[PDB]
Structure formats: structure tokens, C-alpha cells
Design a protein around this ligand. Structure first.
Ligand SMILES: [Cl-]
Length: 98
């Protein structure tokens, strides 16, 4: 769904994505797009979280997560799961989970 329909989607990013300011840049891009959700480093060398917001903004974020990331990161792969349409947002902000 695109446009203004609200969606939620889970993501996991693989590559050189830890120790490169990925979490800070992701949170800044999410807030800039008006998204809520979260980002966290996993014990497997990856980055994961969820995004919630208007379909069009979430998709730009998905592209950012697949192609750009933080300046020194190198994204090899971005996997998205559990994409669903929602009527209300669950989260109120974009968190960095530690
Ligand atoms: Cl990082």
C-alpha cells in the first residue's frame, strides 16, 4: 500500500553495519520522515527493528535502509518481514534500543 495508508514492517540489515554510527543515522532518518519505531544491534552482527508510518514514507525509509545507511556502512542485504496495514501507530517515537 502506498500514499497515506499506515503500515508497519519489521527489518534486518546485513553487511558492515555495526560500529559505523548506523543506529544514530537510522533514527535521524526515521524522525526526518515522521516515522516511529526502533533500531537495535543484534548479537549476530546485524541491525534490526520496525518502522510504522504512512506507506509512502515507510517505502522511502526501506530504500534508505537498502541503499544508503550511515556514511561508512556497507549494506549487503536488507530483509523485510511482517508488513501489515494498521489503523493506529503503536509507538510514539523512533527509539534506539540498547
Ligand atoms: Cl553502527
Amino acid at each position: 500500500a502506498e500514499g497515506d495508508t499506515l503500515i508497519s514492517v519489521d527489518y534486518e540489515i546485513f553487511g558492515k553495519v555495526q560500529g559505523v554510527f548506523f543506529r544514530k543515522y537510522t533514527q535521524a532518518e526515521g524522525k526526518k520522515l515522521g516515522l516511529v519505531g526502533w533500531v537495535q544491534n543484534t548479537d549476530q552482527g546485524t541491525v534490526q527493528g520496525q518502522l510504522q508510518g504512512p506507506a509512502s514514507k515507510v517505502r522511502h525509509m526501506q530504500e534508505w535502509l537498502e541503499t544508503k545507511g550511515s556514511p561508512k556502512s556497507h549494506i549487503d542485504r536488507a530483509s523485510f518481514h511482517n508488513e501489515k496495514v494498521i489503523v493506529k501507530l503503536d509507538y510514539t517515537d523512533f527509539q534506539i534500543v540498547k
